[PDB]
Amino acid sequence: MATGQDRVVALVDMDCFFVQVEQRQNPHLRNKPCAVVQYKSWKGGGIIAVSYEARAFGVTRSMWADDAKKLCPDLLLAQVRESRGKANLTKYREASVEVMEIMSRFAVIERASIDEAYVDLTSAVQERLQKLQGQPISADLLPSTYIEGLPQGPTETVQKEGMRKQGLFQWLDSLQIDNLTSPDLQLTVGAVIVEEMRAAIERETGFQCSAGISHNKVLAKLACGLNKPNRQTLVSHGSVPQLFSQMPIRKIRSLGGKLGASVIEILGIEYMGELTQFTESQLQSHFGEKNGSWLYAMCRGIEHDPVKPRQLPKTIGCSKNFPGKTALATREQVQWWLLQLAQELEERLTKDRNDNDRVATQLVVSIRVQGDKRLSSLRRCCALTRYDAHKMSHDAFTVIKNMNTSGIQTEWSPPLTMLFLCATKFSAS
DNA sequence: AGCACTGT
DNA sequence: ATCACAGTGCT
Ligand SMILES: Nc1nc2c(ncn2[C@H]2C[C@H](O)[C@@H](COP(=O)(O)NP(=O)(O)OP(=O)(O)O)O2)c(=O)[nH]1
Ligand SMILES: [Mg+2]
Ligand SMILES: [Mg+2]
């Protein structure tokens, strides 16, 4: 804990998740360059998930499918289901629940996104350590594990699986010889458990995933990306100095945006490791007490954000953009789409209440007007008393109708480029 | 409470 | 003209 080695934390991330879901359903897509796309009409659809075969051609997320086909002519495409005029992600939310439920059998999980979850293995590691007590850890228990930073020094060596094994052997040889620390043993056992977790996910869903194992959430997530796909990486406390010495600051979670850019600009540094030069007080003065404290500890491999026990989303939301000439202008238009959104929301809320024994109590309504730089022009709350689509849509209209700045009966102005309904403030029931 | 930021 | 979500922190 003084060196931030009290916990064993893992981050599991499903490999090209939406693709895997579609590839499981359509075997003709397996082991092929493939992507998942929503809305075929505009340039073949926007790509939101890309198999690794397709990545090898340069296909990326946030790319029009027509442009993707220019890079990858044999690219196959699965379409997001469309329901009530909009993209419907239910299939991937259900697939995500399959996975989370398996992970819960092993430990406390924090659902971080639709396709990844943090795991706190600290207690499971102790449990496992007293079983087989004193018995050595065989390389056969870690068949897909990389040890970041290894192999090193002097004493297969040209291909990747050979590299992995050498690094693992070096790690395990130093373990059983007492040349490593107690937290290093714990991470190793954590990694044995994460192998079993990943094998169970694949056996029971067909989905492959990658994992990071380390002492905190940031290092776990960083480690998870070092060896994708279908592999897991152990980032020990001792590997942090070399790992961070050339790690771009933007690669650390929460520094990929404006804050990270201002750390680079204000301090004149490029890599996470350079942050160790500064005093905590110096970092607090530039970035605030909380950010400074977090940065001072994080650049040394230390962070204390806990794995929250939260397997379910906190909100259930429903949105649609209306770009360009499709922006909503008549009142009958806003009311029709508000109803479409409200109807999908009701279905999902009803399923939620039956599955998870809880009810939302607040309806958040957000819109965007044509010509606003910000992603949201107005957010407004109202009570959510019944799971009734028509009420929610009327209430959503009631709380935005004052945005219309026009006189004509059947006209809305300025036109709306975005509607968003969100149920929140869940309570047991 | 409304908003900005950050992430998948 | 990507888009559809979702969580956290500030004031
Ligand atoms: N609509 C939309 N969906 C997204 C976006 N980013 C991700 N998703 C959806 C699609 C993704 O399938 C899922 C998980 O996102 P990741 O873990 O960041 N990428 P993946 O799991 O696909 O591949 P790997 O993890 O091996 O890099 O969330 C986005 O910008 N937009
Ligand atoms: Mg993923
Ligand atoms: Mg992910």
Tab-separated table of C-alpha atoms (C1' of nucleotides) and ligand atoms in Angstrom:
chain	number	residue	atom	x	y	z
A	1	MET	CA	0.000	0.000	0.000
A	2	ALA	CA	2.970	2.271	0.671
A	3	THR	CA	4.166	1.148	-2.776
A	4	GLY	CA	0.588	0.562	-3.992
A	5	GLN	CA	0.788	-3.243	-4.014
A	6	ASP	CA	-2.049	-4.142	-1.635
A	7	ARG	CA	-4.622	-5.181	-4.271
A	8	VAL	CA	-4.780	-7.528	-7.233
A	9	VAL	CA	-6.880	-5.837	-9.922
A	10	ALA	CA	-7.765	-7.072	-13.386
A	11	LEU	CA	-9.430	-5.475	-16.385
A	12	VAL	CA	-11.101	-7.790	-18.919
A	13	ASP	CA	-11.913	-6.404	-22.347
A	14	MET	CA	-13.790	-8.333	-25.021
A	15	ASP	CA	-11.892	-8.442	-28.308
A	16	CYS	CA	-13.755	-6.552	-31.084
A	17	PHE	CA	-16.882	-7.240	-29.079
A	18	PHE	CA	-19.730	-6.327	-31.426
A	19	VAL	CA	-17.915	-8.229	-34.205
A	20	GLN	CA	-17.595	-11.345	-32.024
A	21	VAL	CA	-21.326	-11.157	-31.226
A	22	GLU	CA	-22.162	-11.033	-34.937
A	23	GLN	CA	-19.518	-13.644	-35.803
A	24	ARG	CA	-20.987	-16.051	-33.254
A	25	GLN	CA	-24.429	-15.568	-34.831
A	26	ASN	CA	-23.216	-15.737	-38.462
A	27	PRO	CA	-20.453	-18.369	-38.830
A	28	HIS	CA	-19.726	-17.112	-42.359
A	29	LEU	CA	-18.090	-14.047	-40.747
A	30	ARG	CA	-15.631	-15.957	-38.558
A	31	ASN	CA	-11.888	-15.549	-39.172
A	32	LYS	CA	-12.560	-12.976	-41.889
A	33	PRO	CA	-11.986	-9.227	-42.094
A	34	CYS	CA	-15.294	-7.951	-40.789
A	35	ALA	CA	-16.791	-4.876	-39.163
A	36	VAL	CA	-20.063	-3.856	-37.543
A	37	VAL	CA	-21.803	-0.836	-39.053
A	38	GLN	CA	-24.828	1.339	-38.225
A	39	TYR	CA	-27.006	3.002	-40.926
A	40	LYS	CA	-26.126	1.909	-44.480
A	41	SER	CA	-27.445	5.076	-46.131
A	42	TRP	CA	-24.619	7.552	-45.368
A	43	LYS	CA	-21.424	6.260	-47.014
A	44	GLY	CA	-22.277	2.645	-46.289
A	45	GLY	CA	-22.655	3.244	-42.567
A	46	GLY	CA	-20.402	4.298	-39.729
A	47	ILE	CA	-18.060	1.606	-38.449
A	48	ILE	CA	-18.185	1.004	-34.696
A	49	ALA	CA	-16.290	-2.308	-34.374
A	50	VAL	CA	-13.545	-3.919	-36.468
A	51	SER	CA	-12.204	-7.473	-36.432
A	52	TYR	CA	-8.416	-7.853	-36.175
A	53	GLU	CA	-8.194	-9.296	-39.698
A	54	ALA	CA	-9.758	-6.013	-40.872
A	55	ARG	CA	-7.476	-3.867	-38.698
A	56	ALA	CA	-4.488	-5.341	-40.555
A	57	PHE	CA	-5.767	-3.444	-43.622
A	58	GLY	CA	-6.098	-0.153	-41.711
A	59	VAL	CA	-9.864	-0.298	-41.110
A	60	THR	CA	-10.752	1.646	-37.979
A	61	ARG	CA	-13.695	2.604	-35.838
A	62	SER	CA	-15.329	5.938	-36.782
A	63	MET	CA	-14.765	5.305	-40.483
A	64	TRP	CA	-17.387	5.263	-43.211
A	65	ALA	CA	-17.960	1.776	-44.542
A	66	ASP	CA	-17.477	2.988	-48.119
A	67	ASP	CA	-14.003	4.247	-47.201
A	68	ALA	CA	-13.318	1.033	-45.261
A	69	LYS	CA	-14.106	-1.001	-48.395
A	70	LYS	CA	-11.469	1.020	-50.264
A	71	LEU	CA	-8.799	-0.244	-47.861
A	72	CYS	CA	-10.259	-3.756	-47.510
A	73	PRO	CA	-12.190	-4.890	-50.607
A	74	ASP	CA	-13.085	-8.289	-49.077
A	75	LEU	CA	-14.428	-6.654	-45.898
A	76	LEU	CA	-17.638	-8.172	-44.578
A	77	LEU	CA	-20.186	-6.037	-42.719
A	78	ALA	CA	-22.825	-6.797	-40.110
A	79	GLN	CA	-25.521	-4.180	-39.519
A	80	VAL	CA	-26.793	-2.913	-36.185
A	81	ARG	CA	-30.456	-3.790	-35.758
A	82	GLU	CA	-32.773	-0.845	-36.453
A	83	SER	CA	-36.008	-0.522	-34.491
A	84	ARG	CA	-38.517	2.338	-34.411
A	85	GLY	CA	-36.354	4.301	-36.827
A	86	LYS	CA	-33.095	4.077	-34.864
A	87	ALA	CA	-30.133	1.899	-34.025
A	88	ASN	CA	-30.959	-0.708	-31.370
A	89	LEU	CA	-28.070	-2.232	-29.394
A	90	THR	CA	-30.108	-4.781	-27.403
A	91	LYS	CA	-28.260	-7.788	-28.827
A	92	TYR	CA	-24.912	-6.473	-27.578
A	93	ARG	CA	-26.298	-5.460	-24.184
A	94	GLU	CA	-27.631	-9.003	-23.741
A	95	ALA	CA	-24.331	-10.515	-24.885
A	96	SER	CA	-22.574	-8.256	-22.379
A	97	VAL	CA	-24.779	-9.604	-19.564
A	98	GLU	CA	-23.810	-13.175	-20.524
A	99	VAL	CA	-20.163	-12.249	-19.937
A	100	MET	CA	-20.595	-10.180	-16.759
A	101	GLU	CA	-22.591	-12.996	-15.152
A	102	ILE	CA	-19.734	-15.459	-15.705
A	103	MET	CA	-17.175	-12.983	-14.329
A	104	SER	CA	-19.296	-12.481	-11.189
A	105	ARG	CA	-18.796	-16.163	-10.326
A	106	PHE	CA	-15.119	-15.381	-9.655
A	107	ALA	CA	-15.080	-12.004	-7.900
A	108	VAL	CA	-16.555	-8.531	-7.492
A	109	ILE	CA	-16.822	-6.843	-10.885
A	110	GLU	CA	-17.217	-3.212	-11.899
A	111	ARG	CA	-18.951	-2.867	-15.265
A	112	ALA	CA	-16.806	-0.171	-16.909
A	113	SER	CA	-18.415	-0.283	-20.358
A	114	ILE	CA	-20.569	-2.607	-22.430
A	115	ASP	CA	-17.575	-4.864	-23.087
A	116	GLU	CA	-15.160	-4.578	-20.141
A	117	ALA	CA	-15.207	-4.948	-16.381
A	118	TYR	CA	-12.693	-4.393	-13.608
A	119	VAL	CA	-12.126	-7.280	-11.197
A	120	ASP	CA	-10.798	-7.145	-7.630
A	121	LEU	CA	-9.027	-10.479	-7.117
A	122	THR	CA	-7.317	-9.663	-3.803
A	123	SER	CA	-9.502	-12.042	-1.759
A	124	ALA	CA	-9.682	-14.782	-4.375
A	125	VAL	CA	-5.862	-14.740	-4.506
A	126	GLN	CA	-5.623	-15.360	-0.759
A	127	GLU	CA	-8.165	-18.185	-1.069
A	128	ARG	CA	-6.116	-19.744	-3.862
A	129	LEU	CA	-2.819	-19.169	-2.045
A	130	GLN	CA	-3.894	-21.347	0.899
A	131	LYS	CA	-4.916	-24.087	-1.514
A	132	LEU	CA	-1.837	-25.894	-2.841
A	133	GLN	CA	0.000	-23.879	-0.157
A	134	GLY	CA	3.709	-23.926	-0.941
A	135	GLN	CA	3.130	-25.650	-4.287
A	136	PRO	CA	4.903	-23.986	-7.237
A	137	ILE	CA	3.125	-22.253	-10.091
A	138	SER	CA	3.624	-24.115	-13.372
A	139	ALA	CA	3.875	-22.336	-16.710
A	140	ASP	CA	0.979	-24.599	-17.739
A	141	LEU	CA	-1.359	-22.542	-15.555
A	142	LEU	CA	-0.492	-19.360	-17.512
A	143	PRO	CA	-0.807	-20.472	-21.147
A	144	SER	CA	-1.658	-17.027	-22.572
A	145	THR	CA	0.061	-14.713	-20.064
A	146	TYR	CA	2.753	-12.167	-20.939
A	147	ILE	CA	5.013	-10.671	-18.269
A	148	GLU	CA	5.630	-7.041	-19.208
A	149	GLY	CA	9.333	-6.219	-19.323
A	150	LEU	CA	10.446	-9.833	-19.754
A	151	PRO	CA	12.488	-11.468	-21.114
A	152	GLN	CA	15.514	-9.289	-20.368
A	153	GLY	CA	19.270	-9.508	-20.036
A	154	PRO	CA	21.362	-12.386	-21.362
A	155	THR	CA	20.439	-16.065	-21.521
A	156	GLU	CA	12.138	-19.449	-29.808
A	157	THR	CA	13.735	-16.007	-29.555
A	158	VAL	CA	12.524	-14.809	-33.003
A	159	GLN	CA	8.761	-15.564	-32.868
A	160	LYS	CA	6.262	-14.183	-30.409
A	161	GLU	CA	5.134	-17.347	-28.631
A	162	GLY	CA	8.803	-18.082	-28.014
A	163	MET	CA	9.284	-14.611	-26.527
A	164	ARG	CA	6.234	-15.033	-24.275
A	165	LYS	CA	7.458	-18.355	-22.853
A	166	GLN	CA	10.986	-17.093	-22.148
A	167	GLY	CA	9.560	-14.094	-20.321
A	168	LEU	CA	7.170	-16.276	-18.348
A	169	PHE	CA	9.940	-18.748	-17.455
A	170	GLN	CA	12.141	-15.898	-16.232
A	171	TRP	CA	9.278	-14.615	-14.082
A	172	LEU	CA	8.418	-18.058	-12.692
A	173	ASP	CA	12.057	-19.035	-12.122
A	174	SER	CA	12.472	-15.858	-10.026
A	175	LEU	CA	9.227	-16.604	-8.163
A	176	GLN	CA	10.021	-20.109	-6.892
A	177	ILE	CA	13.587	-18.999	-6.009
A	178	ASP	CA	12.297	-16.267	-3.645
A	179	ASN	CA	13.873	-13.554	-5.828
A	180	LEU	CA	10.523	-11.732	-6.173
A	181	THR	CA	8.222	-10.082	-3.635
A	182	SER	CA	4.968	-11.141	-1.992
A	183	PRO	CA	2.847	-8.831	-4.211
A	184	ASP	CA	4.488	-10.347	-7.297
A	185	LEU	CA	3.327	-13.784	-6.154
A	186	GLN	CA	-0.172	-12.359	-5.659
A	187	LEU	CA	-0.304	-10.933	-9.206
A	188	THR	CA	0.862	-14.298	-10.535
A	189	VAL	CA	-1.971	-16.071	-8.721
A	190	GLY	CA	-4.362	-13.376	-9.887
A	191	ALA	CA	-3.206	-14.173	-13.426
A	192	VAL	CA	-3.893	-17.867	-12.920
A	193	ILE	CA	-7.445	-16.949	-11.896
A	194	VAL	CA	-7.840	-14.599	-14.873
A	195	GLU	CA	-6.792	-17.464	-17.161
A	196	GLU	CA	-9.613	-19.527	-15.651
A	197	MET	CA	-12.042	-16.616	-15.917
A	198	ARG	CA	-11.170	-16.109	-19.590
A	199	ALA	CA	-11.370	-19.819	-20.389
A	200	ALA	CA	-14.810	-19.939	-18.760
A	201	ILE	CA	-16.013	-16.909	-20.754
A	202	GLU	CA	-14.878	-18.513	-23.999
A	203	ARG	CA	-16.191	-21.972	-23.148
A	204	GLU	CA	-19.587	-20.595	-22.167
A	205	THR	CA	-20.082	-17.766	-24.695
A	206	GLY	CA	-17.656	-18.373	-27.552
A	207	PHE	CA	-16.228	-14.870	-27.004
A	208	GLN	CA	-12.503	-14.289	-26.646
A	209	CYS	CA	-11.107	-11.477	-24.531
A	210	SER	CA	-7.900	-9.918	-23.277
A	211	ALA	CA	-6.995	-9.014	-19.713
A	212	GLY	CA	-4.583	-6.932	-17.714
A	213	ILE	CA	-3.511	-7.902	-14.202
A	214	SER	CA	-1.817	-5.389	-11.913
A	215	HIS	CA	-2.244	-3.598	-8.585
A	216	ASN	CA	-4.756	-0.916	-9.644
A	217	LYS	CA	-7.286	-0.035	-12.322
A	218	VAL	CA	-5.083	2.196	-14.481
A	219	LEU	CA	-2.252	-0.325	-14.729
A	220	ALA	CA	-4.701	-3.164	-15.328
A	221	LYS	CA	-6.274	-1.301	-18.249
A	222	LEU	CA	-2.885	-0.289	-19.633
A	223	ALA	CA	-1.610	-3.866	-19.347
A	224	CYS	CA	-4.729	-5.192	-21.090
A	225	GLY	CA	-3.869	-3.316	-24.273
A	226	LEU	CA	-0.232	-4.378	-24.458
A	227	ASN	CA	-0.965	-7.815	-25.985
A	228	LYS	CA	-4.233	-7.978	-27.782
A	229	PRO	CA	-6.052	-10.094	-28.940
A	230	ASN	CA	-6.874	-13.153	-26.832
A	231	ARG	CA	-3.959	-12.643	-24.434
A	232	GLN	CA	-3.424	-11.338	-20.915
A	233	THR	CA	-0.562	-9.276	-19.532
A	234	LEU	CA	0.816	-8.988	-15.990
A	235	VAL	CA	2.222	-5.547	-15.158
A	236	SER	CA	4.128	-5.837	-11.900
A	237	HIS	CA	4.978	-2.878	-9.695
A	238	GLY	CA	8.663	-3.278	-10.655
A	239	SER	CA	7.971	-3.021	-14.384
A	240	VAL	CA	6.445	0.477	-14.071
A	241	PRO	CA	9.656	2.587	-14.383
A	242	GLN	CA	10.690	1.104	-17.735
A	243	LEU	CA	7.083	0.826	-18.953
A	244	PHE	CA	6.387	4.465	-18.166
A	245	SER	CA	9.774	5.745	-19.374
A	246	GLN	CA	8.479	5.731	-22.982
A	247	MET	CA	4.715	5.619	-22.399
A	248	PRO	CA	2.921	8.617	-23.951
A	249	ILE	CA	0.954	10.462	-21.299
A	250	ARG	CA	-2.252	10.237	-23.372
A	251	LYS	CA	-2.270	6.409	-23.114
A	252	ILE	CA	-3.086	6.515	-19.375
A	253	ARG	CA	-6.789	6.476	-18.564
A	254	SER	CA	-8.229	9.973	-17.959
A	255	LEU	CA	-5.239	11.682	-19.654
A	256	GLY	CA	-6.383	11.075	-23.246
A	257	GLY	CA	-8.135	14.455	-23.369
A	258	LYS	CA	-7.679	18.102	-22.423
A	259	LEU	CA	-6.033	17.471	-19.040
A	260	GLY	CA	-3.352	15.267	-20.575
A	261	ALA	CA	-2.665	17.825	-23.297
A	262	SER	CA	-2.145	20.528	-20.676
A	263	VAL	CA	0.192	18.300	-18.641
A	264	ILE	CA	2.283	17.931	-21.800
A	265	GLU	CA	2.129	21.647	-22.607
A	266	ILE	CA	2.652	23.081	-19.118
A	267	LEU	CA	5.425	20.745	-17.950
A	268	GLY	CA	7.200	20.304	-21.294
A	269	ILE	CA	7.243	16.490	-21.068
A	270	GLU	CA	6.161	13.603	-23.302
A	271	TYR	CA	6.086	10.436	-21.163
A	272	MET	CA	4.430	9.371	-17.909
A	273	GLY	CA	7.762	8.654	-16.240
A	274	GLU	CA	8.853	12.284	-16.544
A	275	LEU	CA	6.177	13.196	-13.987
A	276	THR	CA	8.312	11.758	-11.155
A	277	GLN	CA	10.602	14.817	-11.359
A	278	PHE	CA	7.934	17.081	-9.858
A	279	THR	CA	6.789	17.448	-6.272
A	280	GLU	CA	3.190	16.693	-5.381
A	281	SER	CA	2.701	20.350	-4.416
A	282	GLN	CA	4.015	21.356	-7.843
A	283	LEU	CA	1.515	19.102	-9.619
A	284	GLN	CA	-1.339	20.302	-7.418
A	285	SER	CA	-0.571	23.923	-8.245
A	286	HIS	CA	-0.815	23.271	-11.992
A	287	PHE	CA	-3.758	20.876	-12.106
A	288	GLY	CA	-5.605	21.047	-8.787
A	289	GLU	CA	-5.300	19.231	-5.475
A	290	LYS	CA	-7.052	16.059	-6.656
A	291	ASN	CA	-5.395	15.787	-10.074
A	292	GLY	CA	-1.987	16.626	-8.622
A	293	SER	CA	-2.213	13.987	-5.901
A	294	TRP	CA	-3.459	11.470	-8.453
A	295	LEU	CA	-0.654	12.294	-10.901
A	296	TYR	CA	2.079	12.231	-8.256
A	297	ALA	CA	1.049	8.728	-7.206
A	298	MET	CA	0.096	7.465	-10.671
A	299	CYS	CA	3.447	8.182	-12.334
A	300	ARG	CA	4.933	5.861	-9.667
A	301	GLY	CA	2.419	3.069	-10.361
A	302	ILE	CA	0.136	3.965	-7.439
A	303	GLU	CA	-3.580	4.740	-7.547
A	304	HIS	CA	-6.397	3.992	-5.118
A	305	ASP	CA	-9.587	4.171	-7.207
A	306	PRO	CA	-11.421	1.061	-5.900
A	307	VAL	CA	-13.200	-1.593	-7.931
A	308	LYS	CA	-16.765	-0.548	-7.228
A	309	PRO	CA	-19.184	-3.487	-6.843
A	310	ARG	CA	-21.491	-2.477	-9.681
A	311	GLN	CA	-22.470	-5.072	-12.251
A	312	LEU	CA	-25.367	-3.050	-13.675
A	313	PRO	CA	-25.472	0.305	-15.486
A	314	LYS	CA	-26.533	3.291	-13.387
A	315	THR	CA	-28.614	4.804	-16.208
A	316	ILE	CA	-30.683	3.536	-19.123
A	317	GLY	CA	-30.566	5.944	-22.039
A	318	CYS	CA	-31.868	6.406	-25.566
A	319	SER	CA	-30.607	8.919	-28.132
A	320	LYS	CA	-30.674	9.821	-31.804
A	321	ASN	CA	-28.828	12.470	-33.787
A	322	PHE	CA	-30.514	14.223	-36.710
A	323	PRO	CA	-27.639	15.796	-38.654
A	324	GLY	CA	-27.650	18.087	-41.650
A	325	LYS	CA	-30.957	18.321	-43.485
A	326	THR	CA	-32.655	15.682	-41.293
A	327	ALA	CA	-32.850	18.028	-38.280
A	328	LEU	CA	-36.329	18.093	-36.762
A	329	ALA	CA	-38.402	21.191	-37.627
A	330	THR	CA	-42.106	20.433	-37.201
A	331	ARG	CA	-43.781	19.792	-33.854
A	332	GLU	CA	-45.324	16.533	-35.098
A	333	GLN	CA	-41.764	15.416	-35.876
A	334	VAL	CA	-40.360	16.048	-32.398
A	335	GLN	CA	-43.379	14.352	-30.840
A	336	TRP	CA	-43.066	11.304	-33.089
A	337	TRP	CA	-39.362	10.748	-32.351
A	338	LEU	CA	-39.756	11.475	-28.628
A	339	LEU	CA	-42.329	8.680	-28.731
A	340	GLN	CA	-40.007	6.313	-30.622
A	341	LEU	CA	-37.274	6.924	-28.056
A	342	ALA	CA	-39.740	6.657	-25.171
A	343	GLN	CA	-41.040	3.327	-26.497
A	344	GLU	CA	-37.602	1.707	-26.685
A	345	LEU	CA	-36.867	3.139	-23.249
A	346	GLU	CA	-40.048	1.628	-21.791
A	347	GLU	CA	-39.219	-1.832	-23.145
A	348	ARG	CA	-35.714	-1.651	-21.690
A	349	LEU	CA	-36.946	-0.242	-18.368
A	350	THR	CA	-39.576	-2.979	-18.009
A	351	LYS	CA	-36.996	-5.677	-18.724
A	352	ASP	CA	-34.694	-3.959	-16.219
A	353	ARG	CA	-37.313	-3.899	-13.456
A	354	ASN	CA	-38.116	-7.602	-13.890
A	355	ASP	CA	-34.466	-8.684	-14.110
A	356	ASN	CA	-32.897	-6.436	-11.476
A	357	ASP	CA	-35.693	-5.478	-9.038
A	358	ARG	CA	-35.346	-1.716	-9.249
A	359	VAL	CA	-37.156	1.274	-10.732
A	360	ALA	CA	-35.933	4.544	-12.172
A	361	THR	CA	-37.410	7.703	-10.682
A	362	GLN	CA	-35.985	10.523	-12.833
A	363	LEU	CA	-36.303	11.145	-16.570
A	364	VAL	CA	-33.503	13.212	-18.083
A	365	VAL	CA	-34.328	14.928	-21.370
A	366	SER	CA	-31.635	16.472	-23.534
A	367	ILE	CA	-31.676	18.061	-26.975
A	368	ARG	CA	-29.322	19.883	-29.322
A	369	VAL	CA	-30.226	22.787	-31.602
A	370	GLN	CA	-28.826	23.248	-35.088
A	371	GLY	CA	-25.802	25.526	-34.848
A	372	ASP	CA	-24.646	24.730	-31.287
A	373	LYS	CA	-20.969	23.849	-30.847
A	374	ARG	CA	-21.637	21.858	-27.677
A	375	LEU	CA	-22.874	18.277	-27.754
A	376	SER	CA	-25.840	19.316	-25.583
A	377	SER	CA	-27.839	22.545	-25.657
A	378	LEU	CA	-30.265	21.835	-22.797
A	379	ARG	CA	-30.585	19.110	-20.154
A	380	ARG	CA	-33.736	18.998	-18.034
A	381	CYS	CA	-35.056	16.661	-15.343
A	382	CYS	CA	-38.591	15.535	-14.581
A	383	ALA	CA	-40.201	12.840	-12.460
A	384	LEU	CA	-40.461	9.300	-13.835
A	385	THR	CA	-43.509	7.794	-12.133
A	386	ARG	CA	-44.707	5.154	-14.582
A	387	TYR	CA	-43.033	3.117	-17.313
A	388	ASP	CA	-45.458	4.507	-19.888
A	389	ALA	CA	-44.079	5.546	-23.261
A	390	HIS	CA	-46.802	8.091	-24.019
A	391	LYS	CA	-46.440	9.833	-20.652
A	392	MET	CA	-42.636	9.999	-20.833
A	393	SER	CA	-42.827	11.400	-24.380
A	394	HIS	CA	-45.431	13.987	-23.361
A	395	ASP	CA	-43.361	14.917	-20.294
A	396	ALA	CA	-40.216	15.175	-22.432
A	397	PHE	CA	-42.132	17.486	-24.766
A	398	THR	CA	-43.526	19.521	-21.868
A	399	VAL	CA	-39.994	20.280	-20.636
A	400	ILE	CA	-38.526	21.162	-24.058
A	401	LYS	CA	-41.547	22.827	-25.709
A	402	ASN	CA	-40.286	26.167	-24.356
A	403	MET	CA	-37.238	25.848	-26.645
A	404	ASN	CA	-39.322	26.466	-29.768
A	405	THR	CA	-38.871	30.142	-30.748
A	406	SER	CA	-41.447	30.245	-33.569
A	407	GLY	CA	-45.077	31.221	-34.026
A	408	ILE	CA	-46.359	28.895	-36.734
A	409	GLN	CA	-48.584	26.192	-35.243
A	410	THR	CA	-46.875	23.124	-36.712
A	411	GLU	CA	-43.280	24.439	-36.787
A	412	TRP	CA	-40.278	23.964	-34.492
A	413	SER	CA	-37.361	26.374	-34.716
A	414	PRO	CA	-34.435	26.190	-34.338
A	415	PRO	CA	-34.390	22.622	-35.694
A	416	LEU	CA	-33.323	19.858	-33.312
A	417	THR	CA	-30.193	17.905	-34.231
A	418	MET	CA	-30.439	15.563	-31.207
A	419	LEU	CA	-32.973	13.998	-28.837
A	420	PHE	CA	-31.910	12.084	-25.728
A	421	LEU	CA	-34.032	10.429	-23.032
A	422	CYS	CA	-32.334	8.886	-19.994
A	423	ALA	CA	-33.777	7.079	-16.984
A	424	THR	CA	-31.737	7.425	-13.814
A	425	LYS	CA	-32.006	7.565	-10.013
A	426	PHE	CA	-32.772	3.876	-9.582
A	427	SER	CA	-34.256	2.621	-6.315
A	428	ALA	CA	-34.845	-0.900	-5.036
A	429	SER	CA	-38.251	-2.541	-5.476
B	1	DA	C1'	-29.243	20.464	-10.625
B	2	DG	C1'	-27.026	21.503	-15.203
B	3	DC	C1'	-22.816	21.071	-17.494
B	4	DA	C1'	-17.910	19.639	-19.128
B	5	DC	C1'	-14.960	16.040	-19.675
B	6	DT	C1'	-13.519	11.274	-20.766
B	7	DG	C1'	-14.274	6.838	-22.218
B	8	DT	C1'	-16.153	2.500	-25.178
C	1	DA	C1'	-22.611	13.691	-41.207
C	2	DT	C1'	-20.244	9.415	-37.929
C	3	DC	C1'	-23.298	7.841	-34.165
C	4	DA	C1'	-25.130	5.541	-29.379
C	5	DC	C1'	-24.335	5.246	-25.451
C	6	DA	C1'	-22.276	5.559	-20.240
C	7	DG	C1'	-19.491	7.292	-15.749
C	8	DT	C1'	-17.190	11.014	-13.076
C	9	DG	C1'	-16.289	15.645	-11.281
C	10	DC	C1'	-17.151	20.684	-10.962
C	11	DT	C1'	-19.914	24.391	-9.218
D	1	LIG	N1	-21.204	3.385	-31.429
D	1	LIG	C1	-19.951	3.257	-30.949
D	1	LIG	N2	-19.643	2.069	-30.391
D	1	LIG	C2	-18.416	1.858	-29.887
D	1	LIG	C3	-17.407	2.924	-29.954
D	1	LIG	N3	-16.298	2.438	-29.381
D	1	LIG	C4	-16.575	1.168	-28.983
D	1	LIG	N4	-17.850	0.825	-29.285
D	1	LIG	C5	-18.538	-0.467	-29.033
D	1	LIG	C6	-18.114	-1.450	-30.111
D	1	LIG	C7	-17.154	-2.396	-29.422
D	1	LIG	O1	-17.298	-3.728	-29.908
D	1	LIG	C8	-17.506	-2.273	-27.944
D	1	LIG	C9	-16.281	-2.339	-27.058
D	1	LIG	O2	-15.410	-1.248	-27.372
D	1	LIG	P1	-13.798	-1.346	-27.381
D	1	LIG	O3	-13.322	-2.284	-26.332
D	1	LIG	O4	-13.146	0.117	-27.201
D	1	LIG	N5	-13.274	-1.959	-28.922
D	1	LIG	P2	-13.546	-3.644	-29.297
D	1	LIG	O5	-14.052	-4.392	-28.117
D	1	LIG	O6	-14.669	-3.776	-30.448
D	1	LIG	O7	-12.125	-4.226	-29.804
D	1	LIG	P3	-10.831	-4.300	-28.830
D	1	LIG	O8	-11.371	-4.150	-27.427
D	1	LIG	O9	-10.255	-5.665	-29.116
D	1	LIG	O10	-9.997	-3.144	-29.343
D	1	LIG	O11	-18.146	-1.006	-27.773
D	1	LIG	C10	-17.810	4.193	-30.585
D	1	LIG	O12	-17.005	5.148	-30.677
D	1	LIG	N6	-19.070	4.276	-31.044
D	2	MG	MG	-13.121	-4.352	-26.348
D	3	MG	MG	-13.648	-2.131	-24.273
